[PDB]
Amino acid sequence: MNRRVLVTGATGLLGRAVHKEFQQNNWHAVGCGFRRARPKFEQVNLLDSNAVHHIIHDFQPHVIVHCAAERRPDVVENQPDAASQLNVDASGNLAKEAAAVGAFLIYISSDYVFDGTNPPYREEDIPAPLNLYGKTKLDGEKAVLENNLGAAVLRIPILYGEVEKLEESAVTVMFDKVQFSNKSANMDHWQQRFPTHVKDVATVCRQLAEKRMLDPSIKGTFHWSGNEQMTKYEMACAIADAFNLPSSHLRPITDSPVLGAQRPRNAQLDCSKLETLGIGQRTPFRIGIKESLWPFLIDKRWRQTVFHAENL
Amino acid sequence: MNRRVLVTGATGLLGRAVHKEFQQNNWHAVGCGFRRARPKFEQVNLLDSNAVHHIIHDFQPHVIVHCAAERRPDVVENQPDAASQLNVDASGNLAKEAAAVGAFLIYISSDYVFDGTNPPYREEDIPAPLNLYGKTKLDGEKAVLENNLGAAVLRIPILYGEVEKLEESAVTVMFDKVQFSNKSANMDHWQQRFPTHVKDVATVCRQLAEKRMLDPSIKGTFHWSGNEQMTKYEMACAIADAFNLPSSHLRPITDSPVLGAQRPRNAQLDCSKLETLGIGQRTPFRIGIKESLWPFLIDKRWRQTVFHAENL
Ligand SMILES: NC(=O)c1ccc[n+]([C@@H]2O[C@H](COP(=O)([O-])OP(=O)(O)OC[C@H]3O[C@@H](n4cnc5c(N)ncnc54)[C@H](OP(=O)(O)O)[C@@H]3O)[C@@H](O)[C@H]2O)c1
Ligand SMILES: NC(=O)c1ccc[n+]([C@@H]2O[C@H](COP(=O)([O-])OP(=O)(O)OC[C@H]3O[C@@H](n4cnc5c(N)ncnc54)[C@H](OP(=O)(O)O)[C@@H]3O)[C@@H](O)[C@H]2O)c1
Ligand SMILES: Oc1ccc(/C=C/c2cc(O)cc(O)c2)cc1
Ligand SMILES: Oc1ccc(/C=C/c2cc(O)cc(O)c2)cc1
Ligand SMILES: Oc1ccc(/C=C/c2cc(O)cc(O)c2)cc1
Ligand SMILES: Oc1ccc(/C=C/c2cc(O)cc(O)c2)cc1
């Protein structure tokens, strides 16, 4: 489309895919990053209200896709006031600036706003976050929707895609456990997950934006999710199957974990609202994960002691 | 050549170029990294003696080019025992393992081992480091040459090349000062520097390795440097000239700085020993820097307030 789009968090796992989607569909796509921004992207600290103000009013975007967030529970628990400032305050300020320029803001939220006791969750179901991250994401939605009426909230589950490091994604972190066949690996078989490709969420954003460019009623809360239900165990096995690797060493743990009280068992998102717009894309997990992980597939060759016990 | 080469610090500024040089010249090049290793390279902590031992004896390299180091004076001063462990202890252990496999080790050193009072410095001139970094690099040479007789030390000056971030290189960090023409910039015109392209140091490593594969006398201390003498000011102006940008805003400071007592004024390296082997390559600074920085050249376009005073 002949429109301008600004993508916050363009250096991140989802942001990279959102920027690619828009750009490849001939939008004037401008991406934002921070530590990893330059040279590919704009270096804008979302915590600096003036920088945010200046790039938005200079670029004059039609759409703003807000991906930038603190999603790491290690940083959200250790630095709770820095997490709130980025996941809540920065989003709210972005909504104020989106409103001033007349830009359609898409706030990216999480399935972690729900307690995962009563799936599937419809957009207008009561959120009950069991962790501070979900609470910051929930308070982020409230901040966005308070300061910008026409904004949209897109709730999505566990993401995977082309990663810079295996730790960039909760699905991709377990690749090494699957590759070290000599050592038994304990894998969660309790929490129900819906692995979603960032490529597919990026399509949903572009489509939603493109719908809004013709229909002013495209606003509010939306849910997007992959339709393949999987536990971390089933995922680990699916990864093994994709690469034709053994999964005999992988042990399922059906029991609720120690931190299980702070994690939603099944926060399944009902996607009927978006499906009502004809919006959506679903890359089969076995295809998507193979695309994502093949560079990290260790070719032993000369590496005789690489799979050694005291190495990871 | 039909030989195997292991490059430590392959993720770093110099390491990336050394690995490319060897690989492009049909060597069996295997690169090592740490935080940025995967998927392109091997993840080996040089501080873990077992990991170092295992990769060296598995790969059985003919040559080892040791680039990995703590070169940041901010980390060398704040964490002096972690800097010594990597710049000294890890190098020495690498020399012990190079010796055990019968691999030609090239230790990359610095012009900062000299006090820069009596240039040009010949390889057998007395080193006198004015800072802890230079002292760790000097003690690194001693560690290497003590534990491996046949090893080579390659002393090089200020490096530049294709950077991931402008901060990756002391030459490239000043690009933003050169680009912000609206603000006057104070540039050092005291310390004499010899900006050297990593591409050119990488050629010198390959050539030295290839010479050693036929001549067992290729060992000891060597010096490599670009032949263009420049102060940070002259460099900043040369960068401006390369891109056809004004340099009127750039102010030279001929006076010795506050930290000037800890920096060698002119640690010019005499390269006659390598020139005696027919070794060397010299990319003209104006060509080399243009290749290195063009991705970081800001195209204003819609970015009206990007060059604003309260932004950098
Ligand atoms: N990852 C999942 O599994 C998943 C599941 C549901 C929803 N989400 C939601 O998805 C959204 C997307 O993020 P992600 O998963 O792709 O996370 P991400 O990989 O962690 O990336 C985070 C992004 O935040 C940017 N950022 C952080 N601080 C910034 C600052 N001060 N100024 C400007 N930018 C800053 C980063 O920039 P630099 O790196 O350049 O510094 C990076 O681009 C998030 O809102 C998240 O809550 C995550
Ligand atoms: N840069 C200059 O201007 C210049 C001038 C003269 C000589 N030097 C000398 O040139 C050599 C090359 O380095 P550089 O300038 O290219 O520096 P660099 O960019 O700082 O890169 C340092 C490298 O060190 C690796 N490393 C650090 N800790 C490690 C560990 N614990 N295990 C394995 N690898 C580790 C890094 O890996 P990860 O990033 O993957 O973690 C990175 O590859 C250095 O020895 C330096 O002293 C520098
Ligand atoms: O390595 C990692 C650190 C944190 C995360 C976040 C995972 C996640 C999973 C969901 O169902 C919803 C959500 O908002 C976030 C993933 C990988
Ligand atoms: O304590 C340890 C025991 C074994 C190892 C194996 C290391 C290793 C790392 C590589 O990238 C390739 C390889 O062939 C071997 C490391 C540490
Ligand atoms: O951003 C930076 C932090 C540290 C450095 C190191 C510079 C340097 C310059 C020399 O003449 C010799 C040397 O060993 C190192 C460069 C850039
Ligand atoms: O305090 C401040 C005053 C001005 C600015 C300018 C920001 C900016 C950043 C971009 O990547 C593009 C742009 O057009 C403008 C930032 C902070």
Residue numbers in the entry:
A (entry chain B), B (entry chain B): 27 to 338
From the article:
We subsequently co-crystallized hMAT2B with NADP and resveratrol and determined the ligand-bound structure (hMAT2Bresv) at 2.8 Å resolution. Minor structural variations between the two structures are found in a loop region of the second domain (residues 282–289, loop C), forming an extended coil in the hMAT2Bresv structure and a two-turn helix in the MAT2Bsubt structure. Each hMAT2Bresv protomer is bound with an NADP molecule in its extended configuration, packing against backbone atoms from the conserved GxxGxxG motif. The MAT2Bresv structure reveals two bound resveratrol molecules (res1 and res2) per protomer, which exhibit different binding modes to the protein (spheres). Res2 slots into a narrow pocket that is formed by the C-terminal residues of one protomer (A), as well as the loop L1–helix α2 region of the adjacent NCS (non-crystallographic symmetry)-related protomer (B) within the asymmetric unit. Res2 is positioned within the hMAT2Bresv dimer interface mainly by van der Waals contacts and hydrogen bonds with two acidic residues (Glu68 and Asp84).
MAT (methionine adenosyltransferase, also known as S-adenosylmethionine synthetase; EC 2.5.1.6) is the only known enzyme that synthesizes SAM (S-adenosylmethionine), the principle methyl group donor and precursor for polyamine and glutathione synthesis. The function of MAT2A is further dependent upon an interaction with the auxiliary subunit MAT2B, encoded by the MAT2B gene.
